[PDB]
């Protein structure tokens, strides 16, 4: 699993379940083309987005639909969504864990990169 | 001053100076059109991006060029940049302050609406 | 104003108003003795805690009563309070700004030393 | 495992390894008595701090020795350590995961509480 996403809820102190995640890869013409998508599980995690064969070097954008998540809880959020943009595998294959911590008017995202 | 940005450096414990910031507004055709831009001052703040007359309801994207900032310090960052996308409501008197806290492999952004 | 505190509310997107803050200085016998205290203003800031004459080198603890703040809003928080423990260096002109961002089950604190 | 601690390094994008953690429980006389301690593993995690039998209701303080960690990397940190103080098991046994994200002049801590 070369690309994993984990989302936590800072208001309830629990994993953010059923959060939609869309991943994009920047194409030759500087356009963001769909790459993979999914929803976080009961543990707030999303695995199996891609394979090492398909996850080649490039610039990727991970979009986390935070807005839908908060509205489903009756809270009015500030952000439309949380975005994480990074260059990946620029120097060989790496395993990426994108973690996000969510609050209505704030979020933090961290990346853990391992071999 | 309806829209203000503040950027801090969590590695050095100081404001992030001379960080380039680009703001975009989503156009009718779902395209991001340039709206305003600038660089943070010595206090890590960026004021005067727009006026209340120009800052109408809409979806905005604030892009903080974090990558250039870290490279200028000899550190290899993870993110290409930090992005904040939000809808400017305009329901009563409201000033938007977008704060960002930067680290090489992490960042947090918070919105203060007063 | 060598020591300033700023508290923000990540749930409401506003400054955390009327939050009690207690500062302690570690004494010779490794005991925490009261040093200063106050409540954040409408801007979520607390100024005038001490003077440069009184703020000498030492280990300080800034305690933010986050629990009372959340309960006053009808939310059950996780933490009893947020604590920031640091050594005031005093190596050249330096002002300390302790910023805290609050959520019911999480908080982040950052120090800006300018 | 009722009490688990996870520490990440926001500067290197990796788990914070070998970070010392001390847990205290507030005693009757309002004194902090040692409860458990350990060091984070290669994954930045610390398990087996206590058992459900021993982890009774009370106020606990989790101290993470962030200062030693940063100095061992040649960086001068701001904080002496990161502290997390909370009431636990006040309404029956719960599983607590204390997560901390570290930077030289900043840190964030989040709690995930499950049954």
């Amino acid at each position: 699993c070369p690309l994993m996403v984990k989302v936590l809820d800072a208001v309830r102190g629990s994993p953010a379940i059923n959060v939609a995640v869309h991943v994009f890869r920047k194409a030759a013409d500087d356009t963001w083309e769909p790459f993979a998508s999914g929803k976080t599980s009961e543990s707030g995690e999303l695995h199996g987005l891609t394979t090492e064969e398909q996850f080649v070097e490039g610039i990727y954008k991970v979009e986390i639909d935070t807005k839908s998540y908060w509205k489903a809880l009756g809270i009015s959020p500030f952000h439309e969504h949380a975005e994480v943009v990074f260059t990946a595998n620029d120097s060989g294959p790496r395993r990426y864990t994108i973690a996000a911590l969510l609050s209505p008017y704030s979020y933090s995202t961290t990346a853990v990169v391992t071999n």
Side-chain angles (χ1 to χ4, degrees), chain A residues 49-92:
Chain A
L49 277 172
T50 185
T51 57
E52 54 185 2
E53 196 69 290
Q54 160 185 296
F55 192 44
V56 299
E57 303 188 310
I59 297 177
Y60 295 76
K61 166 156 62 178
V62 177
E63 191 170 67
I64 305 176
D65 185 18
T66 56
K67 190 172 188 174
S68 295
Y69 177 72
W70 290 120
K71 291 197 295 67
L73 293 180
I75 298 178
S76 62
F78 177 78
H79 310 90
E80 283 299 300
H81 51 243
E83 285 182 42
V84 179
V85 184
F86 59 106
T87 300
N89 310 303
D90 41 291
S91 71

Side-chain angles (χ1 to χ4, degrees), chain A residues 96-107:
Chain A
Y96 299 81
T97 293
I98 303 298
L101 176 63
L102 314 177
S103 287
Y105 285 69
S106 177
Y107 71 79

Side-chain angles (χ1 to χ4, degrees), chain A residues 7-16 69-70 73 100-102:
Chain A
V7 190
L8 297 180
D9 183 323
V11 174
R12 302 149 75 213
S14 64
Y69 177 72
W70 290 120
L73 293 180
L101 176 63
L102 314 177

